[PDB]
Design a protein around this nucleic acid. Structure first.
Lengths: 120, 56, 114, 122, 209
RNA sequence: AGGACCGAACCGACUAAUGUUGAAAAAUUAGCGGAUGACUUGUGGCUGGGGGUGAAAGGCCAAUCAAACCGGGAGAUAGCU
RNA sequence: ACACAGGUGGUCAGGUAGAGAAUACCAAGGCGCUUGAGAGAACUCGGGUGAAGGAACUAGGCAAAAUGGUGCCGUAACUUC
RNA sequence: AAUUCCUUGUCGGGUAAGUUCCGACCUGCACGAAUGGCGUAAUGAUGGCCAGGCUGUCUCCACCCGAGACUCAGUGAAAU
RNA sequence: CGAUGUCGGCUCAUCACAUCCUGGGGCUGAAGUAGGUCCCAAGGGUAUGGCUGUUCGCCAUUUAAAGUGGUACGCGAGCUGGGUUUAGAACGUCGUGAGACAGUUCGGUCCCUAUCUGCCGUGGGCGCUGGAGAACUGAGGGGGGCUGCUCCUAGUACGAGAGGACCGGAGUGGACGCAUCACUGGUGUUCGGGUUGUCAUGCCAAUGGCACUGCCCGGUAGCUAAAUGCGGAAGAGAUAAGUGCUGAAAGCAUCUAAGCACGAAACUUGCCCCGAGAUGAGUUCUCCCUGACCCUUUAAGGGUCCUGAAGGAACGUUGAAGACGACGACGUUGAUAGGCCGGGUGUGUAAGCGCAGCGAUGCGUUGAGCUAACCGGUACUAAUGAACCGUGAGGCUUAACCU
């Protein structure tokens, strides 16, 4: 069964995972740094990191893209204005993910994820 | 259900004399603070391998 | 990196059949039959064309009255003389496998407006 | 492909239009067949055109397959279904007065010498 | 019998006129250098060792540091030792040449097969499948009964059950030769080999072919 | 004009799988029968142990039944365990 | 037995899709539920793809599945009509 | 034959092979006239048999999606 | 008898043989084709369905064969439950009846949370006589075995008549075991297009969730068999059954006794695989370690003060690998994974804008827009420090030799 799969199976149904990472990416463009579990922090890189490359063009051929997920005006207020154009001469690598230890009072794995350039 | 023997102190001694799961060997510190941490994570005041990655 | 490319280019032809599925053709073979070599010809519509190099199968379907006869030729192989086009066609979805289920008026396969 | 209960189609005159496989044979423990196999076959529906009767068990030789063949000239030949030429129960080889379509260019050689008079396409 | 160490580099087709595609595997041999020969009066051996090291020098094992630095200059990889009597090769000789196959009809391959992990006892040992109908259950992917009633009560070494499938170096004992180049370490052979480009391959002259 | 044909609510609990020291002290999943009536359901009453109830099966009558439950006879009796 | 995959007389029973007080998803109004963080091997239950076909399976098409709506055209045997 | 010992009755129909089923045979061990006879119809979770439609029952599996098992942290059983 | 589950089939085993097939011979009323008949040899092999509770059977079709037995007629904590060994009755026969049949047909029930003696898998530890790293020898053993059809032989020899060969040489099938995704299909949710129902994004626009992946399509990487291949070598050694020469027991005679040639598919090796826990712990490639004071009839050690090598672990990034271990690729002495770039490959001409079209919708701009797993390039993000483990020249005796 299964063979190659690089993405994590995590927990609960696929629509739960979808509506978790959709909302958590909204929280990431709201605070630019998140405290969470190592599996969540490392899977949050998907689609959101290449969305910075998508947004670098400021073009009309891309104008109907990158608003399929996280559909709150919080993202399209930054998209093609600074979200994208702030990394447009770096050539890749827009997110950093590192581990912080264990959740306080148990053993669940803790981490953090950030955007590499952020106003605070 | 079936039982031929109730395991003696000496029989269970082979599970209570040489087994391993942890050793807490030496641990890690930064030159800024002697409050010990594990080998590959960030501390609560933001220290990690000389790179001090988050400040508040 | 591919380091057998020079051994694949020993079989592969520099002239690649390149016209998309739905063109109506005539394909020629030598048969050889030990000691009875003769140029033999098959007619139909091309239902598979390009692009996996030496693996490209090249499939043709006769679409004859009450007869769906089908052949796979491998144009890079030593057993094919020629391929020639007599009519244009037009597809814009999939590698034409529906020409098993389409017949007659449904086998007209457009004309590339040519 | 080509197994017990499989339906095949006609290839010769006075042969039947619905014929069924019951034995693949031609070797030990065989269950699947291709072109040039000889099948133990039953007439499953009998018609006024056929010189045959329902439930009569005979032999037939495979000339069309839905999997196809590449042995003849080195390029695949594949058909809409599976078809076989009916064989003579007494004196072996085909018994039909005419064969339909191209068929196989083997059904005319020194193991089928009664058949050289017919006019299929190959 | 001696052999060459290498890898698969791809697959090709050469065709027949009658005809079919004819699959031809492409093999390349590397680092058959030789650094040790074992003979005379001790422990019954007569053998030659190829020592196939090619590793990044920045991570070489401490036992292998200074061990090829005078001859061979590269470490890591399989050592590989083959039986050889009275051919008179030395550690100051020349690397084993794939010209060994210039008049050879067919070759014998030993090489790491595709991994399957645990796979299954019926998938590995080809047992006859019990029907999953009329109320039969828990009988469809199992090795079946592991011994006999009353008397033995100890299990026989003839019964097979769990382990790992694939990764065995196997026996593919007849591949007919198609082309060889000793100036380019290149070998072409008719048919399939075990594994892929991430594997290892050994090739010897054939014996039951 | 429906002891009409099909089919929801409403009633039943026939079929297959699951569960079987269970999540459930027979429950769940999907079918299936009946569904204006020899149909169904709320309330208070009446029928009680050889007596009820039963268009009848040793079916049913409070986790108890070829004679239920509870106080006494009772420490029944035994060419017997 | 309980902060129990449970049971439950009578009322109002919105909008949109629909044959539907089926199922679906939008008001009014409500919720994300006191074990949950990883892993998604063996192993289990439930659900859903696929070629040629084809009952060849099996005592037995049990189960499983195609089919499934509506308007119109059409409708055999036998018959006590 | 819901009753013909044992015997696929004996023969024909349908099947590739039919102890089941369809039709006959009379010479019924133990059919037989309201503890009915025989035919039959509307109804039938009734008993048995055929064919097509269709199909993962099967060739032979190949596979994928949930929710448990599997590992930890707080709490923590049993039959024997 | 204070519970020894039963017949039938499936599935998995194990040992013999009075030999079915294959292999080796003899006889014959054995030309030859067969057949009829008897041991030589158990080395290799030895069915699919119907009706039926059946094993037992009576039938349809295959095959090189459809051999014969043992083990509670082996295998229900490995399977169903047809038959039967749970109530039900039914029709016929019998009892006056409560009921039953040298009666049949039909309805009806099948457990586990696997502990230990065990087996599989995997890690740790002890030892091989200091401390380690990596290969090898083989005390022993398992695996392989047989086998179709066609053409030449062959219409000859032989045979009233009908017919009709031996052998080594080729072609062509099929597969137990084993390899692979190529051939040719299928599937491919991770790539892209078409589309129904509903809700929503302030609205427009066209986009997204959800409904068997809601519906229909191709397709990579991959998976796979419903696909294709390869392999049961010759030799060496000594035999079995058997063929001979020369020649004795028992002065003839004789393949057996001495001598001598020749003898099987099996046996011992070769072919393929396994293996030093082989207290009998083997070899090689090599690598490193050269402490002390106080005390003991003291090669053992006890206390204390000093000093650390070879080489490992921890820490990790990760995949063609994998339950977990482990295995291969990698940790700036850097392309292991992510981002980025370009190739490679798939899908099908985006949205906007204009125009044509009563309008729906198309067409151009435009081979357009988008593109995963395969590959190269690019360090843009990410792959702990001294600390830990493990030393400080290794026991007795025989001998050599320098003080």
């Amino acid at each position: 069964m299964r063979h190659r799969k690089s993405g994590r199976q995590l927990n609960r149904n696929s629509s739960h995972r979808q509506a978790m990472f959709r909302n958590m990416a909204g929280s990431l463009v709201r605070h630019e740094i998140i405290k969470t579990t190592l599996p969540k922090a490392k899977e949050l890189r998907r689609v959101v990191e290449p969305l910075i490359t998508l947004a670098k063009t400021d073009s009309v051929a891309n104008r109907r893209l990158a608003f399929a997920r996280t559909r709150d005006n919080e993202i399209v207020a930054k998209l093609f204005n600074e979200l994208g154009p702030r990394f447009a001469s770096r050539a890749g690598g827009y997110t950093r993910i590192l581990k912080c230890g264990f959740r306080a009072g148990d053993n669940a794995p803790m981490a953090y994820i950030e955007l590499v350039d952020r106003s605070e | 259900a079936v039982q031929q023997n109730k395991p003696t102190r000496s029989k269970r001694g082979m599970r209570r004399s040489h087994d391993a799961l942890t050793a807490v060997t030496s641990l890690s510190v930064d030159k800024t603070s002697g409050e010990k941490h594990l080998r590959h994570h960030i501390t609560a005041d933001g220290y990690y391998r000389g790179r001090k990655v988050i400040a508040k | 990196s591919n380091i057998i490319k020079q051994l694949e280019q020993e079989q592969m032809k520099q002239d690649v059949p390149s016209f998309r599925p739905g063109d109506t053709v005539e394909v020629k073979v030598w048969v050889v039959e030990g000691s009875k070599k003769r140029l033999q010809a098959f007619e139909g519509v091309v239902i598979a064309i390009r692009n996996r190099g030496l693996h490209s199968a090249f499939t043709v379907r006769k679409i004859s009255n009450g007869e769906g006869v089908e052949r796979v030729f491998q144009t890079h192989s030593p057993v094919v003389d020629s391929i020639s086009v007599k009519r244009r066609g037009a597809v814009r979805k999939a590698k034409l496998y529906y020409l098993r289920e389409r017949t007659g008026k449904a086998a007209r396969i457009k004309e590339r407006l040519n | 492909m080509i197994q017990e209960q499989t339906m095949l189609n006609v290839a010769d005159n006075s042969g039947a239009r619905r014929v069924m496989c019951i034995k693949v044979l031609g070797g030990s423990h065989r269950r699947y067949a291709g072109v040039g196999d000889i099948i133990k076959i039953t007439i499953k529906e009998a018609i006024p055109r056929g010189k045959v009767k329902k439930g009569d068990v005979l032999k037939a030789v495979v000339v069309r397959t839905k999997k196809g063949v590449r042995r003849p000239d080195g390029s695949v030949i594949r058909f809409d279904g599976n078809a076989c030429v009916l064989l003579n129960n007494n004196s072996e080889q085909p018994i039909g007065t005419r064969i339909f379509g191209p068929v196989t260019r083997e059904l005319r050689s020194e193991k089928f010498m009664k058949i050289i008079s017919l006019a299929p396409e190959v | 019998m001696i052999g060459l160490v290498g890898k698969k580099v791809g697959m090709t087709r050469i065709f027949t006129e009658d005809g079919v595609s004819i699959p031809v595997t492409v093999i390349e041999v590397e680092a058959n250098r030789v650094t040790q020969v074992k003979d005379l009066a001790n422990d019954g051996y007569r053998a030659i060792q190829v020592t196939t090291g090619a590793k990044k020098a920045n991570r070489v094992t401490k036992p292998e540091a200074g061990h090829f630095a005078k001859a061979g200059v590269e470490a890591g990889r399989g050592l590989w030792e083959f039986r050889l009597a009275e051919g008179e090769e030395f550690t100051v000789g020349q690397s084993i040449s794939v010209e060994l196959f210039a008049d050879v009809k067919k070759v014998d391959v030993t090489g790491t097969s595709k991994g399957k992990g645990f796979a299954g006892t019926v998938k590995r040992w080809n047992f006859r499948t019990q029907d999953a109908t009329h109320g039969n259950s828990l009988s469809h992917r199992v090795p079946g009964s592991i011994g006999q009633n009353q008397t033995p009560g100890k299990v026989f070494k003839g019964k097979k059950m769990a382990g790992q499938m694939g990764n065995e170096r196997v026996t593919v004992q007849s591949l007919d030769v198609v082309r060889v180049d000793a100036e380019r370490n290149l070998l072409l052979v008719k048919g399939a080999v075990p594994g892929a480009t991430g594997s290892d391959l050994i090739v010897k002259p054939a014996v039951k072919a």
